[model samples]
Target chain A: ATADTSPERLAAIAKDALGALNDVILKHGVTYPEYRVFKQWLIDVGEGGEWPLFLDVFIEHSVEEVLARSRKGTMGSIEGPYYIENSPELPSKCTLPMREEDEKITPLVFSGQVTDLDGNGLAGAKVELWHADNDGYYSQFAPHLPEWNLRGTIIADEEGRYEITTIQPAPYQIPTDGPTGQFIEAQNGHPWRPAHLHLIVSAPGKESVTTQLYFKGGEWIDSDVASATKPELILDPKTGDDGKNYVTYNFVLDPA
Target chain B: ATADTSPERLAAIAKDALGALNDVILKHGVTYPEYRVFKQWLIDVGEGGEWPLFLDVFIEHSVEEVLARSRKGTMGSIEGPYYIENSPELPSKCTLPMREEDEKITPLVFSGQVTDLDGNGLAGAKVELWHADNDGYYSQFAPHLPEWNLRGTIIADEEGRYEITTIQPAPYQIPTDGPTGQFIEAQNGHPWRPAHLHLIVSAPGKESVTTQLYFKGGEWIDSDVASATKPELILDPKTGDDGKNYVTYNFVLDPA
Candidate 1:
């Protein structure tokens, strides 16, 4: 949607933001060389097409926190830059689209129900899910995968219950050759984000909840570069004798 | 120059800077759309190649303030992006290199002395001078002018005295067709800088002073977009009987 921030609002926000940065500069006694380095880094971030990746990693968590304050149903997290729209729709119990090679990875069957804040199941509910491969790359983000690999739009049953089967995602480092990575490296910070499944659970007449679910013991779970993991959103899966992992979660939505 | 900041310093600075911005975001309850707009504006600024102009106008003054804290000599202003190295050198009393069209404007005879902090004339002093033409375009920046037009490295006499004649410059708006202009316009801020001469004066065994000299009664003198104007740097030139503007300003250097 087009932005509707008033000129006054923009001016106020700009003033406060710029004022804060200036304060940091003065507080640190930042020198001309350091300032020049920062300017170059800013330019590099844009030229390298990493603003979305960089800001989504470093700043979006705070924005998501702002979003969470008004949210009482399900905890929401950043819908990171890798999400794509219009994946093919599937039935309530179906497999997510994947490549034959993806079948070699450990299988995960994730089941969930969508309900209102009062715990009543909702009708006409839909679950949109997406995640990276075991190699930590999404479909379109990396060229070798199918167009809709591990991505789906599922029409849940009238009871708002559905089950999805896909490969367990692997925790991966963010692009490390760009300005964002360079910035983290300069500060001796790590760049890995915990493995997680991304979801947008929605129902008619209710607010859509966009969130992520991390594995209980996923690498980087405690130190995700995106700072997106939350205790309320962690999933503990059990491995079945059939070699598939199983987990069940539920989503509660607020009225729109 | 390559940066020499330690990992600890980088981490500290980054933490404070990012923390300040987050505080502002939370304070304003900055919404997703507003954040998106800001991100896009940053990208636009870089893509439009206006970082130097944008940052110099909005940020360099603060860095200059930091630099001023340790100096007891002539105040230093931003060395704006237009400065070029190795301008044709002139003798102590020579006119700056200019075109016939530049000569059409009212002449400005700028005389100056470079001295130590105690007022002793410094031997081997040199004054590097540059300023926009009457139309507000620098020689190398705008394609219509000759290289080095109105630019000179004056080899001051052994006693640090020199007089150089050039055309009076006009106060003009910064480029209004780029993202930087759009930012100012969005906030109802005008983008005008006052007419001024750019100078960097230095001598053997003393620190160099980079500064700008503005004329009294100049437009935008009190509201310069760059915030680089200082009362001590303003000049009140007298009109000589021969129809030229005559102004004398001296530079005092701090020890190296």
Candidate 2:
């Protein structure tokens, strides 16, 4: 019963919406409101947005509740559809490695400490980070990017501290070339997702968390259609002594 | 606006349903409750069920209201996923050559007249037919069947009358291997779609109707999960003078 949101409840609850939609399908059904026609966009856009939105919003929210677990822990978010496994790992510090390739995009240093609910520092915890390029595309979801670009696995130091560097992620539009896009366009809306960094923080024998940290003043912050933005998750980045953007947050975890 | 239903309204109404679904994503999110672990059935069974179900129930309902276009027409229904184009066309009477290949299955002849709302015969109308074999598997959707087995195209005679042949299509379960199946199973239900003949009837200067005829005494009639059964759409079958299972219904049309 808990596994699937019961479809009949969903069905009955969805009837009004379905009925409203029926009006339009009738509008087009005689000719092109064709189910055959809906076939293209329903698959391409509506559902195109499903998995990504699910990962970012649905799964992200669920994971946070899982990690908020007991005591406020690291806020978890979407690992995102593009997160690759075994991203090159580092101890205490992680590098973009993409910086040497190009530099106009601002660099950001994200440092964090990992601790248990007891407030005791947990060393050697995973501080995995990934973000999109300033071009607004993810390395994995996009074509022709170097391997593991914009993704890295960093770890906490003996003191429960860690740092990872990467170019600023940029705001990008959701896939707008499909039916979902058409629906948005019909509503006079845009498909932009705010700029943000992805994080998966954890330690041994702990309730590890998966979450995303967002740029405080990022695009669509107030209007993240995904309904995922939380004020606490949004961080304000400032220029550090190295003239790079700096932000910090500690990963708090619950005991396993 | 009246004829073509608008989707914009439906999108907002569906928010409640979508939001309801969002509630459960947390129930099993951190891991499988799975298909958090959703990949197994969510996209495949979920989306598969989503588009088809949307089309059949929502679009189909809208189309019926929109196109109950004439005094009477061959009650059009879903073309279903199994309709293949260009079956062997008969000048008048059509035969299912597959009957000789299997006799354990009961056979039936479907004869019907095509008429205008005023009961005037409409000559040369096209009546295409297809249905599942005894195994409840459609020819195209299944393997190792005759090309166009259990499928054919019949033409109305000069008098607007037609007859087509096939085995008594059996009550077969809809696919139960995925999400849709999961929902029904949860309700302690079966996936059975009652025995029926699929048809797409049309003629020059007439409103074309895509419909299916169900056996009057059919499985799941009182509880058709697809919400597709209709008293008019169901026909009783008896042995004909030629000793084959016989059924007949008249198709009425609206002027194009």
Candidate No. with top DockQ: 1
> What lDDT does candidate 1 reach at residue A190?
97
Quality of model 1 by C-alpha lDDT:
0.89
Ten residues in a row with the worst lDDT in model 2 chain B?
B28-37
List the lowest-lDDT window of 10 residues for candidate 2 chain A.
Answer: A9-18
lDDT of 1 by residue, A10-102 (tens): 789888988888788788888899989988988899899998898888888888888888888999999988889888899999999998889
Fnat per model, in the order shown? 0.58, 0.24
The runs of at least 3 residues in candidate 2 whose Cα sits more than 4 Å from the true structure, single-residue gaps closed, are A1-34, A42-71, A93-96, A102-104, A141-146, A175-188, B1-35, B42-74, B93-99, B102-107, B175-189, B223-225, B240-243
Name the lDDT value of residue B160 in candidate 2: 87
Model 1: residue A85 alpha-carbon error in angstroms: 1.2
